[PDB]
Amino acid sequence: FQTRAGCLIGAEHVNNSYECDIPIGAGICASYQTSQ
Amino acid sequence: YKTPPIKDFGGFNFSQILPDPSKPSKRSFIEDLLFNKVTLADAGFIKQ
Numbered sequence A: 001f002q003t004r005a006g007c008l009i010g011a012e013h014v015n016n017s018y019e020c021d022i023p024i025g026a027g028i029c030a031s032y033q034t035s036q
Numbered sequence B: 001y002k003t004p005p006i007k008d009f010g011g012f013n014f015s016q017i018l019p020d021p022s023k024p025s026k027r028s029f030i031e032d033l034l035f036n037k038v039t040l041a042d043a044g045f046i047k048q
């Protein structure tokens, strides 16, 4: 999923938004959730 | 929070400061003028 900060691999993009847990940057954050 | 549609602020005007829905960036009039006045460099948004 291309992003402003660069390129990520291994994760999955979602539309729902939450409070950031691990700031990736440029309005992008990572979180581990369900399945998991 | 968000501003209500009405502006019955005893005649006080905040137009230049309150966000303008028309502009994509909701920077106030004053803030947009400030950004224009400033001359930044190296935005870094995947620069060629």
Ligand SMILES: *[C@@H]1O[C@H](CO)[C@@H](O[C@@H]2O[C@H](CO)[C@@H](O[C@@H]3O[C@H](CO[C@H]4O[C@H](CO)[C@@H](O)[C@H](O)[C@@H]4O)[C@@H](O)[C@H](O[C@H]4O[C@H](CO)[C@@H](O)[C@H](O)[C@@H]4O)[C@@H]3O)[C@H](O)[C@H]2NC(C)=O)[C@H](O)[C@H]1NC(C)=O
Binding pocket: B007, B011, B012, B013, B014, B015, B016
């Ligand atoms: C809080 O502050 C704002 C900004 O002043 C007020 O919004 C209007 O602002 C104008 C002048 O700035 C007031 O005067 C008259 O406006 C009429 C039409 O208003 C709009 O016109 C265009 C629309 O794109 C805008 O440029 C303008 O800012 C208004 O949004 C016109 O009879 C005159 O405006 C003319 O101004 C210049 C030429 O001098 C050009 O933009 C146009 O040719 C335009 O026709 C006139 O100057 C107006 O009365 C203000 N109120 C309105 C439109 O409702 C807010 O009203 C004010 N709010 C409070 C509570 O004070």
Ligand SMILES: *[C@@H]1O[C@H](CO)[C@@H](O)[C@H](O)[C@H]1NC(C)=O
Binding pocket: A013, A014, A015
């Ligand atoms: C939802 O996700 C997919 C792709 O991620 C796509 O429909 C669109 O980007 C998003 N639309 C909404 C309303 O979230």
